C-alpha cells in the first residue's frame, strides 16, 4: 500500500513505473527482488474534493445516479 501517493518526490514515481512494467527490482547489493506475487495499491487524496463538489453541486442533490 502506497498512501499519500499524491504527495511524494518525483524520483519515487520513476521507481514505481519500473516496478509496474519490468516486474522486479535490484538493490544496491545486486540481489533481485520479485513482484510477480504482489498487488500494488496506491491511495491518493486527489479527486475526493471533486467528488464532494458533485455532492454540493445542487442543494439536496448529487451525482450518484450517473454511470460508474
Amino acid at each position: 500500500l502506497f498512501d499519500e501517493i499524491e504527495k511524494a518526490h518525483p524520483d519515487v514515481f520513476n521507481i514505481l513505473l519500473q516496478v509496474l512494467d519490468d516486474g522486479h527490482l535490484t538493490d544496491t547489493k545486486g540481489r533481485t527482488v520479485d513482484f510477480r506475487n504482489t498487488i500494488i495499491i496506491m491511495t491518493s487524496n486527489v479527486g475526493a474534493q471533486e467528488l464532494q463538489d458533485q455532492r454540493f453541486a445542487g442543494f439536496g442533490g448529487s451525482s450518484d445516479g450517473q454511470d460508474y
Binding site: 453541486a57 445542487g58 442533490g61
Partner: protein, 61 residues
C-alpha cells in the same frame, strides 16, 4: 436597488433584514436570509462567487 449615493440605497435593504425577525414581509419572503456582500471580496477570484451562487441556486432560502 438603484438610487443616488447617500439617498438610502444600502439603507433600503437594512430595514428588510430587521423586519425578518418580526415577520413583516409576506410568506414568499419569509424564512429567507438576506446577505449583503461587498463588491470588493471578488478562476481563483471567481471560485468564491461560483460557490456562493451554487449554494443559493437550488436552495432558494
Amino acid at each position: 436597488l438603484i438610487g443616488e449615493p447617500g439617498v438610502g440605497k444600502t439603507a433600503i435593504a437594512e430595514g428588510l433584514a430587521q423586519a425578518i425577525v418580526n415577520n413583516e414581509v409576506p410568506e414568499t419572503l419569509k424564512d429567507k436570509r438576506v446577505m449583503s456582500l461587498d463588491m470588493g471580496t471578488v478562476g481563483e477570484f471567481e471560485e468564491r462567487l461560483k460557490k456562493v451562487m451554487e449554494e443559493i441556486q437550488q436552495a432558494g432560502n
